[PDB]
RNA sequence: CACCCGUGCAAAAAUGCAGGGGUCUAAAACGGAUAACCUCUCUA
RNA sequence: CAUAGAGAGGUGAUCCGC
């Protein structure tokens, strides 16, 4: 990024008439380095400072870094932000000018600093990412109905954790038509075989059998409420719902526990098997502590390598000491290939239980050493020490680890008491907080890449929150949250939970015994419509991790009709590297890369086998190419949709803050553009914005983004072209993924696909055409639809018309309306 | 290759130069390798 | 007929290499 980070400036904070500077501690920890009053400074961290101040000025501070490869950098004084070249110093606002309201929301008072708002914006990013993956999860559940109804039924949208199943079953005989249809919708859902795609959530190994209705309902109700709370903005106490999950009724806690216990128990039991003999031998050779603490330590050192602190090749030291001894030979058969690794733990305990002075002297020598020659000499002396002082006990290991003794000990266990054993490995539900269990439930419906992105984003944002909460203690600032957000005072615990979650969370497998139902989908995803070949194709499809995504987020024969779109196929296989195109074509065919792409783009469209040796590998080559192409396409469209889900989430959230700040924002459900009009200070009359542009409006625009006349005038001009109904149906298309559901109709006629932005917006614009074709449409929307039929490509004007709700955040509006600005990975020229 | 802020130098209207931005955008830093187990297909 | 004797393909836990 920047020289300030390279110099080690982790942050610069303002606190009244004082400025504080920080550097990177261990991990994401911050340490205080300097304070500036005015043109004058005082050092901190005096025993290991990361950088020094070369000269301090009111414009900015110059620094030189000791912490690494030395660089010289300059950093700008936060108090002169917005105050250079025309009261000359002030604590900066956020761009939205919501800082006083956000501070008065999460904490009780306005704070006169800019440390609190960074924490708050991390809280807002946690909700931002949950709105995305909860929307994806509910879409994945709703897709199960797509073979029976095209509509996104309300059954998932209305659910709340207020109604327990015992007052919902009362609807079975209720007289009210909607409540009856709601229960018959639940009965229709629980009978669908496609629950087998989510076996880890809905099935219990007890063959594995479908759970009792009360738990299926409680799962659906939890995920539905999580979506409703993320995508809408709640009123009253429901706003605090995610932060008051301790208040959930017993059925939801019990279902969360019984879902979370099945991965934990499995992994907490595998380790008690693959290790029995090793743990017993260690528990005999060592007697120095309660054996549960030995087992804890062995688990900890096996699963966490501690290289973030013990950052040196202890394994090289081991080899340097054991080389040339029988310990490096077939002295006994048991460990010539594997099973050797407790020797490392013997070394590790030889560092933890004693000679920690030598370990600290080693860590110092490793900091002071210059050459690999030095580290090698030190390793040789450590080998000379350890091989005489402590290693002799491994001879008793060599006595204990004989093969028949291994076989005997395999019939035995460590005899830790059950309630102690269950507290020396991965914690069970009883200990894990409801938030992490609900995150695990959400992850049950997601792809592995989505699980990784979600969990690591949560880890990062909680670690940031923790770091700021630590900073505020040393600075002596008021840290105490409002009572309703006191959840975040446990954030250091939740980070420890989330990093534990990342240690075992994994993609939802299918039921192994269920595959004979997926067979029909596995054939209908290709369009194959003697039996051994068909069974082989089915088995080589159902095992594919790409099929497991593609059939959960899409209807298979709808994917097969989508694969007839030669332009989109040709585009997505243009982005496959040429060497991969060779690796496919050499396997599928038995000469330019363009003509080979074109040929396999026709092969993948006419793909079939039949009417309902290496040949098998040829068949795999055809299958693996096909599923890969569609996987890349649909994933990226879903990833484009998430960006607009965030945008509408923000529209909902910031409206309530702008309303809370005193702006007459109006009804955001009647017209999503009301906030932008409110921020622009313009008001509709008779359905038209009458006002022309004037500088006096921009100079009074309610946020910093809209202060500039150029983009204010452009947003006003595009907003006069918007239409209420089209923006609302765009919003619902985004929140329901209807554009991706109806992909075989929206994609029917495209000339060319330039990028996934153009494809996604063609899908939306053709959906809006299909929704408004039978309705009265006003002038500019009719022109946009005309240009959408004259050119079989998305209208660049229409997207910047219907995206006008986001205009209040100019950076978001630009990013979501100009391609090449859209994707971090594919930069390009902006227009206008 | 977006937005915003600082500074130097042009300039009276906006350009250039070099930086900063957890308080901006999703957007601060932060190859196979053997063995073991299930599943499918093909002979006798 | 089913289960059995070699192949052969694939998914998911993984021990080291310049
Ligand atoms: Mg941010």
UniProtKB/TrEMBL annotation:
NCBIfam families: VI_Cas13d (NF038189)
Protein name, per record: Uncharacterized protein
Organism from which the protein derives: [Eubacterium] siraeum DSM 15702
């Amino acid at each position: 990024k920047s020289m300030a980070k390279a110099a080690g400036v982790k942050s610069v904070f303002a606190v009244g008439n004082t400025v504080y500077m920080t550097s990177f501690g261990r991990g994401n920890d911050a340490v205080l380095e300097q304070k500036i009053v005015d043109t004058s400074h005082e050092p901190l961290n005096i025993d290991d400072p990361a950088y020094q101040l070369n000269v301090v000025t009111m414009n900015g501070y110059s620094v030189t870094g000791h912490r690494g490869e030395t660089v010289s950098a300059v950093t700008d004084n936060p108090l002169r932000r917005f105050n250079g070249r025309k009261p000359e110093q002030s604590v900066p606002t956020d761009m939205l000018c919501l800082k006083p309201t956000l501070e008065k929301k999460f904490f009780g008072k306005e704070f006169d600093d800019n440390i609190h708002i960074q924490l708050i914006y991390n809280i807002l990013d946690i909700e931002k990412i949950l709105a995305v993956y909860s929307t994806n999860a509910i879409y994945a559940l709703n897709n199960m109905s797509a073979d029976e109804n095209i509509e996104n039924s309300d059954f998932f949208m209305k659910r709340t954790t207020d109604e327990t199943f015992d007052d919902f079953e009362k609807k079975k005989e209720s007289t009210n038509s909607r409540e009856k249809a709601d229960f018959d919708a639940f009965e229709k859902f629980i009978g669908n075989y496609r629950l087998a795609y989510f076996a880890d959530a809905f099935y219990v190994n007890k063959k594995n059998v479908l759970r009792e209705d009360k738990e299926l309902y409680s799962v659906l109700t939890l995920i539905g409420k999580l979506r409703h709370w993320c995508v809408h903005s709640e009123e009253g106490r429901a706003e605090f719902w995610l932060y008051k999950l301790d208040e959930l009724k017993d059925d939801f806690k019990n279902v969360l526990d019984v879902v979370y216990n099945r991965p934990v128990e499995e992994i907490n039991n595998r380790f008690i098997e693959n290790n029995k003999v090793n743990i017993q031998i260690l528990g005999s050779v060592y007697k120095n502590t309660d054996i549960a603490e030995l087992v804890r330590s062995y688990y900890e050192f096996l699963i966490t390598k501690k290289y973030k602190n013990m950052g040196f090749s202890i394994k090289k030291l081991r080899e340097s000491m054991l080389e040339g001894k029988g310990y490096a030979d077939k002295e006994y058969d048991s460990v010539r290939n594997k099973l050797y690794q407790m020797t490392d733990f013997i070394l590790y305990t030889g560092y933890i239980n004693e000679d920690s002075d030598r370990a600290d002297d080693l860590v110092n020598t490793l900091r002071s050493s210059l050459k690999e020659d030095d580290k090698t000499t030190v390793y040789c002396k450590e080998a000379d020490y350890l091989w005489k002082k402590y290693r002799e006990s491994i001879r008793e290991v060599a006595d204990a680890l004989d093969g028949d003794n291994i076989k005997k000990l395999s019939k035995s266990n460590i005899e830790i008491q059950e309630d102690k054993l269950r507290k020396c490995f991965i914690s069970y539900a009883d200990s894990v907080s409801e938030f992490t269990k609900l995150i695990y439930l959400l992850t049950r419906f997601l792809s592995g890449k989505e699980i990784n992105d979600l969990v690591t984003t949560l880890i990062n944002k909680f670690d940031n929150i923790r770091s700021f909460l630590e900073i505020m203690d040393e600075l002596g600032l008021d840290r105490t949250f409002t009572a309703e957000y006191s959840f975040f005072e446990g954030s250091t615990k939740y980070l420890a939970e989330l990093v534990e979650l990342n240690s075992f969370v994994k993609s939802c497998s299918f039921d192994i015994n269920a595959k004979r139902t997926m067979y029909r989908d596995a054939l209908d995803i290709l369009g194959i419509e003697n039996n051994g070949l068909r069974n082989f194709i089915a088995s080589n499809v159902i095992d594919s991790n790409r099929f497991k995504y593609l059939v959960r987020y899409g209807n298979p024969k709808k994917i097969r009709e989508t694969a007839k779109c030669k332009p989109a196929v040709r585009f997505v296989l243009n982005e496959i590297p040429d060497a991969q195109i060779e690796r496919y074509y050499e396997a599928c065919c038995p000469c330019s890369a363009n003509k080979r792409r074109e040929k396999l783009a026709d092969m993948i469209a006419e793909i079939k086998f039949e009417n309902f040796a290496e040949i098998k590998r040829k068949n795999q080559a055809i299958i693996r190419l096909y599923l890969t192409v569609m996987y890349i396409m649909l994933k990226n469209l879903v990833n484009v949709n998430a960006r607009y889900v965030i945008a509408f989430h923000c529209v909902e959230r910031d409206t309530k803050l702008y309303a809370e700040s005193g702006l007459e924002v109006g009804n955001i459900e009647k017209n999503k553009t009301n906030l932008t009009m409110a921020v622009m200070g313009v008001k509709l009359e008779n359905g038209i914005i009458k006002t022309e542009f004037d500088k006096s409006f921009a100079e009074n625009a309610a946020n910093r983004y809209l202060r500039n006349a150029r983009w204010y005038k452009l947003i006003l001009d595009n907003l006069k072209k918007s239409e209420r109904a089209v923006v609302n149906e765009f919003r619902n298309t985004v929140c329901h993924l209807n554009a991706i559901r109806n992909i075989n109709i929206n994609i029917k006629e495209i000339k060319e696909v330039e990028n996934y932005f153009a494809l996604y917006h063609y899908l939306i614009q053709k959906h809006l055409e299909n929704r408004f074709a039978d309705k009265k449409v006003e002038r500019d929307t009719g022109d946009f639809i005309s240009k959408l039929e004259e050119h079989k490509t998305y209208c660049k004007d229409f997207v910047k018309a219907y995206c006008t709700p986001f205009g209040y955040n100019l950076v978001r509006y630009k990013n979501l309306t100009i391609d090449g600005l859209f994707d971090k990975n594919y930069p390009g020229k902006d227009d206008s």
